[PDB]
TrEMBL record, chain B:
Lineage of the organism: Viruses, Duplodnaviria, Heunggongvirae, Uroviricota, Caudoviricetes
Protein name: Internal virion protein B
Superkingdom in the source lineage: Viruses
Organism: Pectobacterium phage PhiM1
Automatic annotation (TrEMBL), chain C:
Organism: Pectobacterium phage PhiM1
Parent sequence residues shown: 373 to 446 of 1263
Protein name, per record: Putative internal core protein
Amino acid sequence: KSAEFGSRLQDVIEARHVLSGKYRSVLTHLEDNRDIGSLGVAHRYVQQMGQGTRFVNGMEFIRRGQAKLVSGLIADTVDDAIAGNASAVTAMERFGLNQQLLDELRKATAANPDMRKWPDSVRMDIEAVTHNMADSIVLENRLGEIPAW
Amino acid sequence: ESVTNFKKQYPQATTVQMDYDPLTQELIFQGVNAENQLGTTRASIPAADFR
Amino acid sequence: RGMSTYEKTILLHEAAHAKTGRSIRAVESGAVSDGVVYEAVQRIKEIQWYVKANVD
């Protein structure tokens, strides 16, 4: 209901920042580089559910549902950091940011807010920063828990 | 020895299940719950030292 | 036997690079989720990340 956050949650559910544009690298990396075994919930139910095809065929749907949510969360929390929220910046740096990248990112975003893609000057760094984050969440979040950081 | 160590590490575990992984020649222990559900505890032991 | 005491210690010092054989296995899905080594790789990668912001 809150006007302060509902808009961003809607965007995270609808996957409007992830399907095309700057951030699709994350979704591409997660989509075709992992399997149903990475859900964790797969292990917890392989024996109640009939262990047949109806299990594996169904689990792919959940994989492709969850990947979009994770990517949308990362995309949201990166733009929030670029905006100025200090609490996010001190969590972004856990995966390798530094003043040099952030200054250039803020400069680039101001000249052109459209940004169908990142500039070639800083592409290969921020791209690697995000990919490191994407892997970590999948490992800590397996149980359905909120990591400390 | 393996069973005693596994139970010492995880007192809350009531039952133990054993499985074999042929690809890496590995033996795996895991705690189990009712309704055929599985827990989070796990352990690994190579076959060479067991033999 | 035809080696000095100093050299044959450097031989063990370089053989301590055995990590490479184990870093690779934790990048490929060979050591799937085996404890100890899987956690050590993660908490070495975390330190690798840390040094950039604050100081493969």
